[PDB]
């Protein structure tokens, strides 16, 4: 009986507070994810969780942390959109085919 009211109140308040704060975190990440998304490739992945990125600018950068994506769902050669200057991976990009590649079909 006591558990019903006590846990309902406490857990409901915790859920609401964490919902608001998760919404704030998601808004912060969404706003910080600047759209330019300099495209890059992950030449190699090494365990400290860290990635080696070769930007489309023809430069390779070591990343102290992968970024906003999961290391497990990544492998060499994947198209990852890193930031213009920070060079941190912001989002995985779907397999892209150059116009010439499509034309060859």
């Amino acid at each position: 009986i006591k558990i019903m009211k006590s846990e309902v109140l406490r857990v409901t308040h915790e859920l609401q507070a964490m919902k608001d704060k998760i919404k704030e975190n998601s808004e912060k990440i969404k706003v910080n994810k600047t759209l330019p998304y300099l495209v890059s490739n992950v030449i190699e992945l090494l365990d400290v969780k860290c990635a080696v990125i070769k930007t489309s600018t023809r430069q390779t950068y070591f990343l102290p942390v992968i970024g906003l994506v999961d290391a497990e769902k990544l492998k060499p050669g994947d198209l990852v959109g890193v930031n213009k200057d920070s060079y941190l991976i912001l989002e995985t990009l779907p397999t892209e085919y150059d116009s010439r590649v499509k034309a060859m079909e």
């Binding site: 330019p36 300099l38 495209v39 930007t55 990009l93 779907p94 892209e96 085919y97 150059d98 116009s99």
Partner: protein, 44 residues
């Protein structure tokens, strides 16, 4: 624009500079830009 992503996102090859994932400005409509079309982009 090598590819169109689906707010839609566009992968644009700036000749030799680098590859960018940019979105259209309010001036242009999404239907105007098609995959493989060469389009202008601001330098910033």
């Amino acid at each position: 624009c090598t590819k169109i992503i689906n707010d839609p996102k566009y992968i644009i090859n700036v000749k030799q500079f680098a590859k960018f994932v940019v979105d259209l400005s309010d001036q242009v409509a999404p239907t105007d830009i098609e995959e493989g079309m060469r389009v202008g982009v601001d330098r910033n």
